[PDB]
Amino acid sequence: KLIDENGRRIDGRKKYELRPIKMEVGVLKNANGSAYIEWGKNKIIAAVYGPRELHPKHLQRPDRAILRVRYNMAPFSVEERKKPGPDRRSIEISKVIKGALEPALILEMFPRTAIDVFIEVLQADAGTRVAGITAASLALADAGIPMRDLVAACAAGKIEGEIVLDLNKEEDNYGEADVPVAIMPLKNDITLLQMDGYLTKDEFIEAVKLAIKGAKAVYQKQREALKEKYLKIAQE
Amino acid sequence: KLIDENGRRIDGRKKYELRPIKMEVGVLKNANGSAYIEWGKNKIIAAVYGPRELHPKHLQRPDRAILRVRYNMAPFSVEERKKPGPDRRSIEISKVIKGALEPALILEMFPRTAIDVFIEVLQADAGTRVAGITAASLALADAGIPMRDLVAACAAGKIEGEIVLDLNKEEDNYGEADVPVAIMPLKNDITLLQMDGYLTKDEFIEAVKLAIKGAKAVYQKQREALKEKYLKIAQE
Amino acid sequence: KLIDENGRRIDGRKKYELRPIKMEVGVLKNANGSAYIEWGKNKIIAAVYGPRELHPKHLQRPDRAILRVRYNMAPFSVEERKKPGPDRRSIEISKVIKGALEPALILEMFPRTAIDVFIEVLQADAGTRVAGITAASLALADAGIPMRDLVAACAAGKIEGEIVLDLNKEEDNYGEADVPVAIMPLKNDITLLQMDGYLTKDEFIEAVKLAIKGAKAVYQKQREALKEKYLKIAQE
Amino acid sequence: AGIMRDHIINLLKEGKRIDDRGFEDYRPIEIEVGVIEKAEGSALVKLGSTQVLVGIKTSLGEPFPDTPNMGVMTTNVELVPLASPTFEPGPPDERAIELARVIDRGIRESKALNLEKMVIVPGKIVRVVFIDVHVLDHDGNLMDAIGIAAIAALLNARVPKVRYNEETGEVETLDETEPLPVEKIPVPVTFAKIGNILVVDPSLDEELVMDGKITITTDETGHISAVQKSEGGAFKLEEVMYAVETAFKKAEEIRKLILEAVEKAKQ
Amino acid sequence: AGIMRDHIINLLKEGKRIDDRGFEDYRPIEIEVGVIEKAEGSALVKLGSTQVLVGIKTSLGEPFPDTPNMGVMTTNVELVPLASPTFEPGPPDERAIELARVIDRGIRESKALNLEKMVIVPGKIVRVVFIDVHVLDHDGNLMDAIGIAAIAALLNARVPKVRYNEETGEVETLDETEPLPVEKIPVPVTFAKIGNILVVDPSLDEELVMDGKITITTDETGHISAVQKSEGGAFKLEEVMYAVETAFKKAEEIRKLILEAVEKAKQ
Amino acid sequence: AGIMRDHIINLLKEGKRIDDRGFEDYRPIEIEVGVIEKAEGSALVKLGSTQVLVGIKTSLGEPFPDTPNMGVMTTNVELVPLASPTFEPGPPDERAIELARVIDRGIRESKALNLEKMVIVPGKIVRVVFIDVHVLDHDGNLMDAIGIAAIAALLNARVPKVRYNEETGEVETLDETEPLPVEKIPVPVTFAKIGNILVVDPSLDEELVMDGKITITTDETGHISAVQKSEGGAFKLEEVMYAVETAFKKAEEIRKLILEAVEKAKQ
Ligand SMILES: Nc1ncnc2c1ncn2[C@@H]1O[C@H](COP(=O)(O)OP(=O)(O)O)[C@@H](O)[C@H]1O
Ligand SMILES: Nc1ncnc2c1ncn2[C@@H]1O[C@H](COP(=O)(O)OP(=O)(O)O)[C@@H](O)[C@H]1O
Ligand SMILES: Nc1ncnc2c1ncn2[C@@H]1O[C@H](COP(=O)(O)OP(=O)(O)O)[C@@H](O)[C@H]1O
Structure with missing residues (x-):
């Protein structure tokens, strides 16, 4: 029943420590942009298409691109196998991810088009929506999409009385609160x-404040993953 | 096992008596027309839209408006909770309501358009399709739609040998016959x-004859509910 | 446990014998073409439409007709009643039937159109996909569709060690292999x-070789069923 | 084809129909029972070029909670895309639903299939009857053709004798068959109203111009077990009176053919 | 109607709203509980012209494997096509899903419906609560109207007393009713951010031009049991701080009306 | 891109492919097993830029009525919209269905996963194996990549030891793991026929111009456990003969890589 062992956590982490985080951009041939994220035990791909042809004109917007996000968990991503197909949870996270990424995008630049974002959770462990939003910005940046900022995301929570950074499965399951936040760091605009x-x-x-600090940390890894991308085309 | 207690009914009614009926027009801001009906323990809203843009041209008719009816029962409307979603019953009633309202409408007046009728049963008690058709005409009349007549509707049945007017749940459940009729009263045209x-x-x-008498009774309440509507705009 | 009784089969057939096969063309008023096939205990109708208007332009191909096949089994066609609706099996057979018929069709002749093939299995007994492909060519030929050849089809298998022609239910169920083949006979092109x-x-x-011999046999019945068709309009 | 309302309407005015039938004639009827051997029951029915196949399949199962006294009957209509260009791939549309529901109702409400005589063990094991309608060609009047094929197919049905063993508690399914408890033969008779004339058994072409349609399902005891006005249009009471009367008479002519086809198949 | 962003935005700049409300005013509120007699509980809620009906229906069933200790609570929102032209026939869209999920969460996470006090036999027989939201007219702020109607309808609910008989092993459902174990009254308070101003209880017209929306659900003990920023746009920390504070104050004003309507219905 | 049939066709004529492979070469292969730790088994497979992830998940459940003797195996392919612009959100299309079914069949029909060695209690408790295919990038030849990843992932699988306690009647799931009874390594080898030439392992670009495709799945004992000609086009008997022969040889080269990747992961 013990989540802070005095006053460290189950995995050895301190109240405001991050799980290890590795991100990489441009991992898929077919998507216009992609990113892969390993955030603790989370393994997530983000794919972007395009701006591409929206079908039909009914769905077309006259002055702007629409953003379409689908968040989905592979059946093998969770401890107890998940039948495939969106569920209510996934539908909701899709919506809120959409809302997290929209403010960052200059949609009026590609009118009559759709930008499709796919977040596939290959292994889940808590923080998938934030790890997903983090990789979905890198993937949008990867697809050459103009953006007012990246969207960085991180969750805080309360476990055994204490406000802590970046829950794992156990702390989320058994904790008292889970507060995901997503921000556009440069101007401190909360998009989730x-x-x-x-x-x-x-x-x-x-x-909210704690998660904003971890989101800013994650933001520096996003820039670094993007810096890594332009060190790779600067050959040569 | 007793439905006529000599020779009155369970609720005190005589063989050809109506349950109390209250109807009101213009109850929703958003619909082009609406009516609310309390008919015994039945509580039903009818909403109409518009004539509105039909999508796509595939569904468009060149010389006329199409009528689309959806009858639906709220989960809480029935004694044993109903999972939401049309079922076979609702699909069929939708169809027959459509057929009851179509002859009354001058569809050739709004070509390439759809008139959408929504019948929501908030509490059911038998006679929902007839109470629905009754409120769906008021709602069409409410939306300013030109009509050859109102469509009035009422059911008769046979319980314990006897032909009776306007079944409740118990008499319908346990009776021998349920005969819903819908008519355009002025010319005696049976549309259901x-x-x-x-x-x-x-x-x-x-x-059939008995239900036609109760439908004519219901027709006078429809006119009265419409008369009530023009006493309310005649202020001032 | 006995499928060759020394060395004849359960139904009396020899290793390379066909079940009785009867085929007839032009059995439905509404389809552009039809065929009925009784192949052992299999009873299958094939219907064709048209080349007809494909909806919408999205689905339209610019230089050619598309072929759409739906294979389906009536609930009463199988020993244990089948809930209606495609299942994974039917979806797959539809696809492979499509692939069996496509090479035979000169699609570039009716651009922007769909040719719809419906295979309905009214009684199944093994070999439905081959009996279906056999009747679906006659039905295409019936609809006046230009074709490089008919597509003839037949299955071989291995039961109790032995390669045999045209499995029934029992031999398929309990045998070791089922090898359906479909061919365009004139040029020996395997399309399934x-x-x-x-x-x-x-x-x-x-x-493969054995099934090709039985497919060639079935091909002579297809020609004969088509010859029968022009002996019927040659009155007079 | 709006050219064709005018033609059909004017022909009616002169007392004629497009195929030279009287207003009360059916197109030629073909009933054949026993056609799907693997089914428990079946019937192929042709009303003119309208063709429908019904299969009866039975199994044993649980009754419904509320009726532990009764066996189960369930009716499904497939309007196969092959039957018509107006039929589409997917779940029943409202046409398939309304036909299914009306045909079931005429049977159920007449107790033509006696569900009480289908119990094996009350509350636990009952016979479950699937009436599975397969529409093969739509050329008008599916309602009648469907109801005809369905009752014809119930009467054709032979289901395995089932035994409840008392010492063992178990239910033995025997090889010996028996008929279903079919105690009535309800038959739908459908009219198209086109203008001010009602016409029995409309073809497709008449359905394309009719105002509305009314179905009256009657049995041999002179009772009605379903009425359904369908599509648009309106009827006069007396047109309803007329249709009820005419239906009983067409129903007896049809019931007789149902019966011959049933017997021709036990030879 | 892009004409209308400009109008609404400029009015805000001058400290006004389109219907003359303050930035912290709700439109007139009508709460009425007990309106669907056949339901166990119900509430009709009007936020201005926004109208939503909630029904409570209960039955007895199995608990979830993992929580044999707890009764079952399930929330569904129907955005009926009649409510809005933006509502379509079919399964919940994400709007219906997100509203359902947020309203459930504020209730569940506050333990406003105490699921532990809904067990009949641990691991086997629990009470199952259906919160069924029926949106009748969408004129803005479904989130609040929904959460209001739902908690109002839980408090209205009277469910039958159930008895577990120990000698018989059976569960007797008595005619006597009792309330559900409703121990808190969480209320969502929703803000529209339009430009740089946040406005409580947005109408439809304000939702059509808002940048984004944030919902804070609070109970009478001064805790928060759900926050949901929804749609697009971004918020500043202090706008979040402001919204949390204002929500508690609007929640108490609303809770009071919830309570009157609850009592007015036991008379 | 109809420009590209001509190019690919003419290159073939000169004995070449677009990426300089022989007609019998595979693109570079990357197999990596054990990649989803939370899964019981997994494999990431790259055929060139084609990427597919398979997860193995197991639970205990009821066997099928007819096979109380056998454990359960079930194969699902998700063609994720992220993999391709030709992939759409929703239930498997026929492509996803046909790939799933062919990969299952080659495994099942070879008894590569021995279902008989997966019984805990005959007729009641069996192991249920989910083979869940996740296509991450479609650049040609999903069939092979899928079958490779799936068998690689079965061999990677470690499932918990289960014990049936006889005194207690209960089934104890132990912490100790064990492999699945994987007794063969079937591998699909797929050819594109483009004109009159067959080419192994087609890329996307070759699939866009091929006439047709044939898959032959073989195991290490020299048997075939699935053949599937797919898409349109026609094959000659000798092209079929050729493909069968070449498949066994490519299958052994691939099986070897499957095996290394399997062992590299137990270090
Ligand atoms: N359907 C599911 N089955 C099993 N575990 C799940 C499921 N959905 C979520 N989980 C676990 O709970 C974790 C936390 O859930 P939640 O807060 O809802 O989403 P997030 O991953 O954004 O935190 C998920 O990462 C996942 O590990
Ligand atoms: N799904 C259902 N669950 C519970 N009760 C129902 C259901 N459907 C209908 N009923 C009850 O039966 C009554 C009469 O049914 P019916 O004749 O089929 O429709 P109508 O309401 O038009 O008479 C309904 O008003 C309703 O009270
Ligand atoms: N869903 C089903 N239920 C019962 N029997 C079936 C079902 N599907 C197929 N069968 C039986 O197995 C036979 C052989 O199956 P299969 O090889 O899969 O197709 P084909 O009919 O082409 O040989 C079918 O003809 C049918 O008799």
Whole structure:
């Protein structure tokens, strides 16, 4: 029943420590952009298409591109096999990911078009929606899409009384609150904010603040993964 | 096992008496027309849209509006909760309601368009398809749609040998026949006629006739509900 | 446990004998073409439409007709009632039937159009996909569709060690291999080839060869059924 | 083809139909039962060029909670894309649903299939009857053709004798067959109203111009077990009176053919 | 109607809204509980012209494997085509899903419906609560209207007393009713951010021009049991701080109305 | 891109392919097993830029009525929209179905996964194997890549030891793992026929111009456990003869890589 062993966590982490995070851009031949993220035990691909032809004109918007996001978990990604197909959870995360990425995109630049983002969770462990939003910005940046900023994302929570950074499965399952946040760092604009659980106002707010610090950390890995991309075309 | 207590009914009604009926027009901001009906324990809303843009041209008719009806029961409308979603019953009632309302509408007046009728049963008690058709005409009349007449509807049945007017749940469940009728009163044109059960020819025909009398009664409440509507815009 | 009774089969047939086969063309008023096939206990109708209007332009091909095949089994066609609706099996057979008929069709002749083939299995007994492909060519020929050849089809198998012609239900169920083949006979072009089971190379190849002989036999019945068609309009 | 309403309407005015039938004539009827050997029951029915195949399949199962006293009957209509260009691949549309529901109702409500005589063990093991309608060619009047094929196929049905063993608690399915408890022969008779004339057994061409359609399903005891006005249009009471009367008479002419076809198949 | 962003935006700049509300005012609220007698619980809620009906229906069933200790709660939102031209026939879209999920979560996570006090026999027989949301008219702020109607309808609910008989092993459902174990009253308070101003309870017209929307669900004990930023746009931390604070205050004003409507219905 | 049939066809005529492969060469192969730790088994397979991930997940369940003797094996292919612009959101299309079915069949029909050695209690408790194929990038020859990843992932699988306790009647799931009874390594070898030439392992670009495609799945004992000609086009008997022969030889070269990758992962 023990999540802080005095005052470290089950995996050895401190209250405000991140799980190891590795991200890579341009991992798929076919997508216009891609990123792969390993964030703790999470393994997620993001694919982007295009701006591409939207069908039909009914779905077409006259002055702008529409953003379509589909978040999905492979059946083998979870401890107990998931039948494939969206469920209510996935539908909701898709929506909120959409909402997290939209403000970052200059949609009026590709009118009558769709930009499709696919987030595939190959292994899940908590924080998939934030790891997904983090890799989905790199993938949009990978597809050469103009963006006001990257969208960086990270979750905080409350476990055994304490506000902590970046829950794993166990802490999320058994904790008291999970607060995912997504931001466009440069201007401190929160593009995702959810709270699941039970918090006082001052606990909610410390969590929002804590997750914003971890999102800013994740933001430096996004830039670094993008810097890595232009060190690879600078050959030669 | 007793439906006529000598020779009154379970709820105190006589063989040819109506359950209390209250109808009101223009109850929704968004619909082009609406009506609410409380008919015994039935509580039903009808919404109409528009004549509106039909999508796509494939579905478009060149010389006329199409009528689309969807009858649906809220999960909480029935004694045992109904999973939401059309079922075979609802599909069929939708069709027959469509057929009940179509002859009353001058569709050739709005070509290439759809008129959408939604019948939502919030509480059911028997007679929902007839209470639905009754409120769906008021709602069409509410939306300013030109009509050759209103469509008034009422059911008769046979319980414990006897032809009776306007079954409740119990009499329908346990009776011998349920005969819904819908008519355009002014010219005596039957636009809905179904019989479920087991009747002689002369019992079928008395039932049809009886339901036509109750439909004519309901027709006077429809006119009255419409008269009430123009007493409300005549302010001022 | 006995499928060759020394060395005849359960139904009295020899290793390379066909079940009785009767085929007839032009059995439906509405289809552009039809054929009915009784092949052992199999009873199958094939219907063709048209070349007809493909909807929408999205689905339209610019230089050619598309072929759409739907293979389906009536619920009463199988020993244990089948819920209606495609299943994975039917989806796959549809695809492979499509692939069996496509090479025979001169699609570039009716551009922007669909040719719809419906194969309905009214009684199944093994060999439905081959009996279906056999009747689906007659039906295409019936609809006046230009074709490089008919597509004739037949299955071979291995039961109790032996390569045999045209399995029934029992031999398929309990045999070792089922090898359906479809060909355009005149030029010996294999348009369907599947193997389900476990065979050596030399057993696979004898089966392919054996089924090609039975497909050539079936081809002579197809021509005969077509010859029968023009003896019927030559009145007068 | 709006050219064709005018033609059909004017022909009616002169007392004629397009194929020279009277207003009360059916097109030629072909009933054949026993056609799907693997089914428990079956019937192929042709109303003119309209063709429908019904299969009866039975199994044993649980009754419904509320009726532990009764066997199970379930009716499904497949409007196969092959039958018509108006039929599409996918789940029943409302046409398939309404035909299924009306045909079931005429049977169920007449107790033509006596569900009480289908119990093996009350509350636990009952016979489950699948009436599976396969429409092969739509050329008008599916309602009648369907109801004809279905009752013809129930009467054709031979289901395995089942035994409840008392010492063992188990249910033995014997090789010996028996008929289903079919105690009535309800037959739908359908009219198209085109203008002010009602015409029995409309063809496709008449359905394309009719105002509306009314089906009256009657049995041999002179009762009605389903009425369904369908499509648009309106009827007069007396047109309803007329249709009820005419239906009983057409139903007896049809019932007789149902019966011959049933017997011709036990030879 | 892109004419209307400009109008609404400029009005905001001058401190006004289109219907003359303050930035923190709700439109007139109508709560009425007990309206679907056949339901176990119900509430009709009007936020201005936004109308939503919730029904509570209960039955007894198996708990989930992992929680044999707990009763079952399940929330479904129907965005009926009648409510809006933007609502379509078919399975929940993501709007219906996200509203359902957020309203459930605020209730569940506050334990407003105490699922532990809904067990009949641990691991086997629990009460199953259906919260069935029926949106009748969409004129803005479904999130609040839904959450209001739902908690109002839980508090309205009277479910039959159930008895587990120990001698018989059986579960007796008595005619006597009792309330559900409703121990908190979470209320969603939703803001539209339009430009740089946040406005409570947006109408349809404000939702059509807002950048984004944030919902904070609070209970009477001063805790938050759900936050949901929805749609596009971005918020500043302090706008989040502001919204949390304002939500608690609007939640108490609303909770009070929820309570009156609950009591007015036991008279 | 109809420009590209001509190019590919003319290159073939000169004995060449677009990426300089022989007609019998595979693109570079990358097999890596054990990649989804939470799965019981997994394999990532790259045929050139074609990438597919298979997960093995196992649970215990009921066998099928007819086979109480046998464990359960079930194969699903997800053609994820991310893999290709030709892949769409929704239920398997026929491409996903046919790939799933062919890969299952080669395994099942070779008894590569021995289902008889997966029984815990005959008729009641068997192991249920989910082979879940996730296509990550479609650049040609999904059939082979899928079959490779799937068998590689079965061989990688370690499932928990299960014990049937006889005194207790219960089934204990132990922490100790064991391999699945994988007794063969069937590998699909797929050819594209483009004109009159067959080419192994077609890329996307070759699939866009091929006439037709034939897959031959063989195991290490020199048997064939599935053949599937797919798409359109026609083959000559001798092209079939050729493909069968060449498949066994490519299958052994591939089986060897499957085996190294399997062993490299137990270090
Ligand atoms: N359908 C499922 N089956 C099993 N485990 C799941 C399922 N859905 C989610 N989980 C586990 O719970 C974790 C946390 O869930 P949640 O907060 O809902 O999403 P997120 O991954 O964004 O935190 C997921 O990463 C996953 O490990
Ligand atoms: N799915 C259902 N669950 C519970 N009760 C139902 C259901 N459908 C219908 N009923 C009850 O039976 C009544 C009468 O049914 P019916 O004759 O089929 O329709 P109508 O309401 O037109 O009479 C309905 O009003 C309703 O009270
Ligand atoms: N869903 C099913 N239910 C019962 N029997 C079936 C089913 N599908 C197929 N069968 C039987 O197995 C036979 C052989 O199957 P198969 O080889 O898969 O197709 P084909 O009919 O082409 O040989 C079928 O003709 C049929 O008799």
